[PDB]
Design a protein around this ligand. Sequence first.
Ligand SMILES: Nc1nc2c(ncn2[C@@H]2O[C@H](COP(=O)(O)OP(=O)(O)OP(=O)(O)O)[C@@H](O)[C@H]2O)c(=O)[nH]1
Ligand SMILES: Nc1nc2c(ncn2[C@@H]2O[C@H](COP(=O)(O)OP(=O)(O)O)[C@@H](O)[C@H]2O)c(=O)[nH]1
Ligand SMILES: Nc1nc2c(ncn2[C@@H]2O[C@H](COP(=O)(O)OP(=O)(O)O)[C@@H](O)[C@H]2O)c(=O)[nH]1
Lengths: 430, 84, 172, 431, 431
Amino acid sequence: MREVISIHIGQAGIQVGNACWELYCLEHGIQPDGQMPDDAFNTFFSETGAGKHVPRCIFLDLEPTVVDEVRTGTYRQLFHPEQLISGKEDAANNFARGHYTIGKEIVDLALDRIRKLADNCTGLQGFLVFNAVGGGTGSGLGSLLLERLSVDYGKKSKLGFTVYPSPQVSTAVVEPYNSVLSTHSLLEHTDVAVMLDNEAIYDICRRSLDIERPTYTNLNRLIAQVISSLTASLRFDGALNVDITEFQTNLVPYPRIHFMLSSYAPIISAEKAYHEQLSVAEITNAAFEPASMMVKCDPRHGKYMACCLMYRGDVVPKDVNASVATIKTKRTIQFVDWCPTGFKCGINYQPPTVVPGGDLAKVQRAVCMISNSTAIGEIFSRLDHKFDLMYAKRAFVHWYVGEGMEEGEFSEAREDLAALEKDFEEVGAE
Amino acid sequence: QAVKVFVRTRPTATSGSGLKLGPDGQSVSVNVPKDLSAGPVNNQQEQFSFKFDGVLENVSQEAAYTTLAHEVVDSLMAGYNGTI
Amino acid sequence: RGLTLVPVRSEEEALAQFFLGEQGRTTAGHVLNAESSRSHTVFTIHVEMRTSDAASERAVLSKLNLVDLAGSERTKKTGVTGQTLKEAQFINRSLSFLEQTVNALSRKDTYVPFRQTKLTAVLRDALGGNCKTVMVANIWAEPSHNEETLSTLRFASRVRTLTTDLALNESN
Amino acid sequence: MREIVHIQGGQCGNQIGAKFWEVVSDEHGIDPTGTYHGDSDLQLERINVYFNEATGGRYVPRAILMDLEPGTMDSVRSGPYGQIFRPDNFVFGQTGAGNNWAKGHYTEGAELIDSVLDVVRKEAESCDCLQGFQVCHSLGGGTGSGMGTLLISKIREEYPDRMMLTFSVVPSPKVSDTVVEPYNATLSVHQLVENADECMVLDNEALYDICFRTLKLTTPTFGDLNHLISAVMSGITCCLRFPGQLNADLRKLAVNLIPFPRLHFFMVGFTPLTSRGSQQYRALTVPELTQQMWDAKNMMCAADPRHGRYLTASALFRGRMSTKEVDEQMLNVQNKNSSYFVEWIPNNVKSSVCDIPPKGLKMSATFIGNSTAIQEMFKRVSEQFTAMFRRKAFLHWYTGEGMDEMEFTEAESNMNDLVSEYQQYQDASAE
Amino acid sequence: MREIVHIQGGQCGNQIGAKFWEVVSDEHGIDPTGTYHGDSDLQLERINVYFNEATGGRYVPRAILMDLEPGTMDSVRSGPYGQIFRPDNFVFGQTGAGNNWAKGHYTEGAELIDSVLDVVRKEAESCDCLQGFQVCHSLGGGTGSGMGTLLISKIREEYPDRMMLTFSVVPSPKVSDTVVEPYNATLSVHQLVENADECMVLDNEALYDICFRTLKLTTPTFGDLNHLISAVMSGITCCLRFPGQLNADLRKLAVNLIPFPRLHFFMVGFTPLTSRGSQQYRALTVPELTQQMWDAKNMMCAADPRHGRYLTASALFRGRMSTKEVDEQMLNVQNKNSSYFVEWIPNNVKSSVCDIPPKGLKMSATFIGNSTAIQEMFKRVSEQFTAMFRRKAFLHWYTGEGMDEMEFTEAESNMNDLVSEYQQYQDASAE
Ligand SMILES: Nc1nc2c(ncn2[C@@H]2O[C@H](COP(=O)(O)OP(=O)(O)OP(=O)(O)O)[C@@H](O)[C@H]2O)c(=O)[nH]1
Ligand SMILES: Nc1nc2c(ncn2[C@@H]2O[C@H](COP(=O)(O)OP(=O)(O)O)[C@@H](O)[C@H]2O)c(=O)[nH]1
Ligand SMILES: Nc1nc2c(ncn2[C@@H]2O[C@H](COP(=O)(O)OP(=O)(O)O)[C@@H](O)[C@H]2O)c(=O)[nH]1
């Protein structure tokens, strides 16, 4: 009744989808074979007559290795084999490759499979598109797929949980290029974009989880917990129900401004767990601590526009209201002048489940704070000079142009992120 | 010895909505329409102006040649090189 | 080297050679243009001066390159790889290399590479060297062609920064 | 399902390819009779990259060996892994090219090139999806360099979009093997600049330095140098053959490495290269691997990177490792040695991770650095080429093969243009 | 129950026919004494296509061996399978034609042709239904070419509607056996154009090249060439003798192959021809067989298909195979080599599949290509004929046999007309 279609594009999208679907299977009790020994699964799984549940997801990639790892792993009998879509040639960190030449047939097939998936849902709350801004598959194919989805499905809430390149640390070289291109692309298609930085999640893992050697599996587990907290009000009842459609109206003040910081709490290992009270007020304070933000973007630089709080577990409205009142009275947290309310509180009675073998502890309370703030303009400011620094002497431009792009496209993308900078400054200023 | 970047515009026989203008034959400006739906009063990019060595909105080929490469061909016969 | 230089002594054979080139050049169907030019064509008129007294005095070494580049396609309408997109990618790469050479010349860096494509290799003496260059920017004002028009205008504006030499080179 | 067609050229190229195929079969658990004996699913998972299955369980390499003299491939066939290769993929002439690039490119390579392309097309069309070709050979050799460049040109014409990878053994700086090395190298670099998409520069003297200083060997024969080169050629594509936490194929490496098309010559190195005495004494950590990686001595090219500036640098790590560790270490390296790194590229690092390290090694890492230091190698080769060409020493051998004298000047001009290209991006300033 | 009358003519024809009958008897499980020793129902199911049952379990071939000198027939009878033929089907003269077409067609051919026709009629009338006649011989021989042309003309007169199939071994390009080969071949081509409905062109030197290159044999005698020709001759009719998933008889092949009546000369090939050494190494797949099929080296004719244009091409596959696989492979071949394929025929593919492969081979495929490439062979034979006829060398015997000089000019005129038609349909454009 409340179905949500999940899309996972590129290696990062698929590798966070693995964590997401492990978490959902554990949360609903579905065994990895496919069937479980009411109807809370319908948001993520569609049940067949034999009792086997197949998830409403689509694993899209131009590279065979990542998808074949899923085809060979434990979840080979869960996902639909036609839902797993693999290409032949990788996008090679080339947005033009993943958006103009290789991505065409793959996005056509993905649209067909997504249409088959959406015909199976009575209602449709929206799409959860999981990609990584900074790779040809994630950027190019993600943008192409989102454009086609906007064209055909239309008004459906598309939530893009994108991973943006970190300020200083990075793994690619043309990452600023394809990041700017994908930002230009998805500025006008996705309805709510959630920004994530590997650097910030690494800092979270190092400081709170005490993992001196964080890895992608840990990052994806944290992201999956955030997504499960976000979707908890779809599957499990509780006071202050929130919906995917409510996220848009209570978080996006203007359509251009829809990029969002995300922060989970608590992030504590078992050893340090049950050593602190972890009350509602304290976990809200931790969630609004600048360190717990999963984007390398200090909120103290900007001004909060909206803060949607997602509480899970034994949380009472009296405590949540007292905590948010303390947050409002606190001087360090600063909101814009034109948003006196600026808070979207939601509670739920299903605490987040713990994945065995993970580092997260079993905590009876959880908070996912998703904030629209003008501070996020800082990351765009960083990418805007990282782009033009190489673009001044046209580094790597021949690669992108070789797959059917033009210098005008680079100029247009740069101008659009400049316009986004002006948008952030304008909305921040009185 | 300078580079004389001239601009010539295709006369749209269908007469589409033309946004370019030339005030004095030197400068050309294009006004991209701001998208009303996308971020109302939150876009801030509408105008793009440039200055060149000449603009030809609608001229015959004779006029185009006379204003484009006559000097270059004259230089060619005066021994200089030329490239259009 | 290896280019068939054809001497001309009257207007009619010049016209005939040019129209033979017009026939021989590669043109393909396209949505924006019925017969799009899918190749950068270069028609060089080589002029060899000699004085009124002549007798081996102040001769030869003059050039005039008339070049019609291939259009810069957005590569979202063509689609078909059947020698409409595969060659469009090459056209775009050559044009981007030309624009990068223009950027390096405007910055007036030391070497400003010319070997990265046959286009810059052919126009090495042009755009610099000792040659009077006059770029033409053909634009098309349409409600949806504004992006392409602005790309052309930006390239032309960055080209205007350049200024070359004019040496009365003669025969050696 | 992304195949790679291997080609070996000349004596040096054929020996390197034989060692490379031995190492690949070892890593995939393939015995010299072709039967798989590895007892691991991942080894057979992506075996189709390098091998095809015969009627039985036999797995034959997708390799093509060329030579103008049959002695080198007779030695190859007598080698330990000589029987795996297709008997049809041994293509030989009758008389060898006397260290003459002209003979190997115009006179004698012309007849054999048709058979070579026939075999190459037969191997390539059989492939489902073709990542590209890798050609192992040596600059400064007649049949090797000549046929390598001619074949690379032909394959570029046939498959423009397919990846081309070259492992070229550039003539060593200090001690030269053949006298006409500068001629052959200068003529071959001209073809590699235009045709080869991705090129690896290797020097025998740099290999001798690495094996005598880090490996501390006493009698390093050519087998050991070919073994190190083979280890690097495996490490460059292990992301194609094994699951990786952050995988990166050959085209991804090329895109992230090459800023401008002509600057596709790379110095490469392998880690961890440890002496037998200090194997137990060394601690396998990602910081140690990176520290050994960024040493100039680890480079298998003669040029040392300290003189030049790193345009880009990729590192393909292998093993169960922390991506946070890897990224932090290489960001720290960039910050500490920012002077050696190009300013107008904010991040000069392409980091990739694979989950399957080579056998015996808990961790490993192959490095591919594009730096302007290779300027000095090209400059030295030009300092020799011009000295010989002013007096036209040995030029009659090349001229009598039907190659114009103008071609030498044109090749030198191209090579010096590349040198100045590297210099411009060595001393170019931001803004 | 669609019978075929096999006729062998001349020494080469008799040897090839003996090998063909040995191969067919081996395939059908017939021992040299004729008793069925096959242990398979399908072998006897359509044994009547080529053989007849005697009073006992003996089976007699429907073969006629016709010659002017008894030595070749004595050798054939002393051979391993010389006893199968009915002793009445050996029609021999007493004085052979000295490699003289005039002798084999006019002087010595008149007497023996009556007995030959009598035996042909006796063998044909016994048949329930007659598909037609197949005559194996060599162009460039007196009795061979002579008996072949005269008998084919007589059979054309008697049975106009019955299929006529010829296997002519055309004189080889570079090395010729007899001096008068161009004369005999030119005289025979004129008759084969007019009378033979369907003809295969074979070359001894193309046979030599294929057996030395693909088979890699060291000292292969004429027996091996006859073996390969026999394999093609069997595969052309295995659809008649064995069940087929998509069967196609001789007349179906002729209709699908011959666009215009005069262009009925075809070059054939057989796959898979694998060297003994690489038999274990090659992969037996439909794509592999198609790739070997479309190679110019696998073609049994000296003329290479690359020079000409394929008017049509039929492929008779044998074995348990996917019809989708075969059709997709051959369509892909056409798409790739569309430059070599005639434009005004939308599909140049005639694929037939039989369920019973030859003994020993899991799968096989015979190829029959009608292409304009044979133009160059006709041109070469004309270049030899004209050179000899300009000086009238060796013309005096043909003059003394009662054959007019005008016949040489007429034969050359028709042969050059065939060359012109090949050129016309090679360079004919659509619309
Ligand atoms: N948070 C997180 N990010 C990841 C993970 N894996 C990869 N990434 C990021 O994803 C980016 C590239 O993703 P992809 O585009 O999918 O890489 P790919 O599969 O090779 O596809 P292409 O590079 O586009 O050809 C890298 O810059 C990484 O920073 C992961 O497991 N977790
Ligand atoms: N690494 C390595 N290099 C070699 C080997 N054999 C020869 N070389 C080098 O290859 C260079 C060129 O020789 P080569 O091209 O093989 O001669 P060619 O085959 O006749 O053209 C020489 O300078 C040698 O130093 C070998 O086994 N390993
Ligand atoms: N394949 C094959 N060809 C043969 C054989 N014997 C002869 N030939 C070829 O047949 C050609 C013509 O000889 P042929 O007509 O039989 O001589 P004739 O019997 O006197 O007319 C010669 O050029 C030979 O090369 C053989 O045993 N096998």
